[PDB]
Paper text:
In the present work, we report the kinetic and structural characterization of the isoenzyme GSTM1-1 from Camelus dromedarius (CdGSTM1-1). Kinetics analysis showed that the enzyme displays a relative narrow substrate specificity and restricted ability to bind xenobiotic compounds.
The crystal structures of CdGSΤM1-1 were determined by X-ray crystallography in complex with the substrate (GSH) or the reaction product (S-p-nitrobenzyl-GSH), providing snapshots of the induced-fit catalytic mechanism. Pro39 (CdGSTM1-1 numbering) appears to be highly conserved in mu class GSTs and is responsible for providing a characteristic extended loop connecting β2 and α2 from domain I. The ligands, S-(p-nitrobenzyl) glutathione (GTB), bound to the G-site (GSH part) and H-site (nitro-benzyl moiety) of CdGSTM1-1, and formic acid (FMT), bound to the H-site, are shown in Figure 7A. Notably, a move of loop β2-α2 upon binding of S-p-nitrobenzyl-GSH (~4 Å) was observed, which may suggest an induced-fit mechanism to facilitate the binding of various substrates. Similarly, Trp8 and Leu13 are found to be conserved in all compared structures and are involved in the stabilization of GTB moiety in the active site via H-bonding interaction and pi-alkyl interaction with the nitro-benzyl ring, respectively. The carbonyl oxygen of Gln72 and carboxyl group of Asp106 are likely to form an H-bond with the γ-Glu amino moiety of GTB. The amide group and side chain hydroxyl group of Ser73 are found to be H-bonded to the α-carboxyl group of GTB.
Residue numbers in the entry:
A (entry chain B), B (entry chain F): 1 to 217
Write the structure that this text describes.
């Protein structure tokens, strides 16, 4: 089976786990646990980081037969090619690439404040940035079924993930964008996704690592 | 003709400018100038930022007919798909996706230090992290003619750009890695590339924007 290596949190592997369940992949998780504060012991991962035959050792990683991958986006793309979840036309391909890279910039905007020791002083300023972020995503989606067009694509998993994270931090953030509320519902009720979610191996939380000031659980 | 919008520096646009040149694309640059300290006035861009039809307005952007793109990586892939500059085997596509994402993370590691007011204090530690980064690139390349196989790829433009920046910062950083030196010469030897590098267009500098501690001139 395939091995998904990541920390015992949601973070960067969540859209991957989401994809791995929708696609019917057989896979298992190599969970790395992090030591409690203050030292946040990473030695469980650091001890085998350079022992896995990874070109650029990192988390998350994925092993599939002869293929050993890092970089979360590269893994998503790998799973997508094996299981018909890329864009076909040039129009979808452009939308995929722009949204894939944009999701990561949007995720890091948010990660950078929650992981900041000064999160509480920076929290009101970031909360007022969120309406325009979400509005970009609502205008991009428009009247489409999925973000790339008619068909489910791997970027939809990225989009659901980053939107989920923002709406956990700010439960009212999608309220003036009904088309994104309908997107999240439609995604959560695919069927392999509903089954995964209302199952025990669905990792609700923590959203982030232990040293984060929010969503560390 | 295609329109490439960026600041009047090297920055994130550099690999796009090379690929545009190498593919013989018909292109013009919309160059935005930024004010001097202390304001670093951005009005030349903010004047138009939201009036260009961009889904996620940003720099660099590319306007090609009806297609209006942002995200430097999406722009590179858009150009590559027009000229078959992407991998064809599943092994090549894996090497492309991993290196594309790795090159941005490595670029960002460097950009963060140079733009940090505390640059001088951070410089010693960052210098000692460079040998390990280059070793990983060196062993990834191996004896291959290019990073993805025997066929030039857009990710080669990214790897040249990021490696060029690190060797501009630390001139001895490729010394103990001969295969990376051969990669850089062979890349510069490309006829359309050398001709672009030999004309007073070539913005090898400034690496970064005016407010950077290093590479601002
Ligand atoms: N660009 C890479 C990022 C890889 C990465 O940063 N992994 C970190 C995650 S914690 C830092 C982190 C937390 C949360 C976010 N985020 O935006 O959600 C980003 C980075 C790690 O655990 N180990 C890397 C190592 O061995 O040095 C990817 O997308 O896979
Ligand atoms: N992920 C996007 C990043 C786009 C971006 O941040 N552009 C900045 C570049 S300056 C900040 C910057 C400098 C250098 C790097 N780098 O890695 O070298 C990254 C970001 C800008 O000028 N305007 C965006 C805006 O108007 O909001 C991409 O790759 O295109
Ligand atoms: Na499908
Ligand atoms: Na404006
Ligand atoms: Na080589």
């Amino acid at each position: 089976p395939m091995i998904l290596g990541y920390w015992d949190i949601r973070g960067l592997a969540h859209a991957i786990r989401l994809l791995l369940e929708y696609t019917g992949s057989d896979y298992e998780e190599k969970i790395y646990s992090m030591g409690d504060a203050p030292d946040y012991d990473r030695s469980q991962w650091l001890s085998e980081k350079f022992k896995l035959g990874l070109d650029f050792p990192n988390l998350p990683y994925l092993i599939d037969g002869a293929h050993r991958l890092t970089q979360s986006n590269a893994i998503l793309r790998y799973i997508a090619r094996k299981h018909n979840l890329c864009g076909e036309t040039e129009e979808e391909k452009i939308r995929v690439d722009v949204l894939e890279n944009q999701a990561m910039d949007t995720r890091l905007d948010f990660a950078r404040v929650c992981y900041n020791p000064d999160f509480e002083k920076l929290k009101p300023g970031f909360l007022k940035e969120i309406p325009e972020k979400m509005k970009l995503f609502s205008e991009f989606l428009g009247k489409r079924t999925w973000f790339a067009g008619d068909k489910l694509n791997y970027v939809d998993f990225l989009a659901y993930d980053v939107l989920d994270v923002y709406r956990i931090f700010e439960p009212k953030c999608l309220d003036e964008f009904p088309n994104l509320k309908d997107f999240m519902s439609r995604f959560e009720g695919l069927k392999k996704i509903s089954a995964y979610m209302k199952s025990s191996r669905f990792l609700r939380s923590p959203l982030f690592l232990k040293m984060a000031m929010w969503g560390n659980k």
